[PDB]
Amino acid sequence: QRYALVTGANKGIGFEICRQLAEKGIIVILTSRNEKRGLEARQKLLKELNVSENRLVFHQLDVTDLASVAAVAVFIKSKFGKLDILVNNAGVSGVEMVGDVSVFNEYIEADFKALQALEAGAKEEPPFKPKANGEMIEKFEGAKDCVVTNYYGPKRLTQALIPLLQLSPSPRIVNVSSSFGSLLLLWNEWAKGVLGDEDRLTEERVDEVVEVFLKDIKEGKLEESQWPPHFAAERVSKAALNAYTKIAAKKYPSFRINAICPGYAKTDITFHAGPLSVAEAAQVPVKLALLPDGGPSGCFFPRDKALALY
Ligand SMILES: NC(=O)c1ccc[n+]([C@@H]2O[C@H](COP(=O)([O-])OP(=O)(O)OC[C@H]3O[C@@H](n4cnc5c(N)ncnc54)[C@H](OP(=O)(O)O)[C@@H]3O)[C@@H](O)[C@H]2O)c1
């Protein structure tokens, strides 16, 4: 029997990851930071799956709360004795909208277009201002929450669950990153060199990058910095997550540890805009959670590359 834990699973992609793994016969620990939302999610999904009660287990988990993280490791040890699959799905954007919320989608569309141009060799990210009457507000508190959730969360939960994952015959970690973690989007030349220098990459180096970013947004104005012009904490945190994916994969070679982008999908975080359904999005992390032994590890896969892997 295989056991999978999914973070941020009361809604969105994480809820659908739980569905798709459970349909494979994997026993899923659906976790969520709010107990009521998670219990209700478990009830709804058990109904929709139409399977017996033991196929889906709820446990509270806030990935920014070190006691919460420790407690779920104790629970898994006592109830199951091992873990086979960890999906680090929980995430936040670091952005507060003012005015017309579809401005969030305007910036997403602009940044995918910019990434395509940079991936094709363009040297510069085009400047962007939105059309509709709204703006993305990026403050220190949001950025800190974004970094602590998106980067420290997966790192700390990975570290807490290593002893249980080591008892699996095929240990799997999937980190739900985003395409906006590309170093092409990160702007900061020091940080791009650090996160890109794989032979010198350590957890200490990545922690240092994100802490310099947070100090910069706290203490001054990012427009004067060499950090990104917008989605700054999203970019930094997801780049840091991708780097930690590589660090962990090298440290735990018997595991397969990968980062993915699910594609642009309709969830609360995107105001339910984007071309993909939430079921379509979850296909990507599920694909890497079921990767056969010997497959790639330590990598970042965007959607189409992920789905083509086998
Ligand atoms: N949708 C897209 O287009 C897209 C594209 C690329 C990457 N992603 C990534 O996909 C992941 C899932 O987001 P989504 O699109 O499914 O959005 P979503 O519907 O907003 O779901 C986010 C989930 O994360 C949970 N969460 C947030 N902070 C948490 C914390 N401290 N501890 C535990 N759970 C926490 C949320 O819980 P609450 O209900 O309590 O807030 C919710 O369950 C994120 O990591 C995001 O960066 C999404």
Author numbering: 5 to 314
Question: What did the authors write?
Answer:
Three salutaridine/menthone reductase like subfamilies of short‐chain dehydrogenases/reductases (SDRs)2 from Mentha piperita were identified, namely (−)‐menthone:(−)‐menthol reductase (MMR), (−)‐menthone:(+)‐neomenthol reductase (MNMR), and isopiperitenone reductase (IPR).1a,1b MMR and MNMR catalyze the ketoreduction of (−)‐menthone 1 a to (1R,2S,5R)‐menthol 2 a and (1S,2S,5R)‐neomenthol 2 b, respectively.1a Additionally, they act on isomenthone 1 b to produce (1R,2R,5R)‐neoisomenthol 2 c and (1R,2S,5S)‐isomenthol 2 d, respectively. Interestingly, the three Mentha SDRs have high protein‐sequence identities (63–68 %), so we performed comparative studies of MMR, MNMR, and IPR, to pinpoint the determinants of ketoreductase vs. ene‐reductase activity within SDRs. A key difference in the sequences between the ketoreductases and IPR was a substitution of the highly conserved catalytic Tyr residue for Glu (238 in IPR). We determined crystal structures of both MNMR and IPR, the latter in combination with NADP+, alkene 3 a, and β‐cyclocitral (non‐substrate).
A sequence alignment of the three ketoreductases MMR, MNMR, and salutaridine reductase (SalR; 45–49 % homology to Mentha enzymes) from Papaver somniferum L with IPR showed each enzyme contained typical SDR‐like motifs, such as those involved in central β‐sheet stabilization, and a TGxxxGhG motif.4b The latter motif in the Mentha enzymes contains the motif TGxxKGIG, predictive of a preference for NADP(H) over NAD(H). In some cases, where not commercially available, product standards were synthesized to confirm whether ene reduction or ketoreduction had occurred. No ketoreduction was observed with any substrate tested. No other major changes in residue positions were observed in the co‐crystal structures.
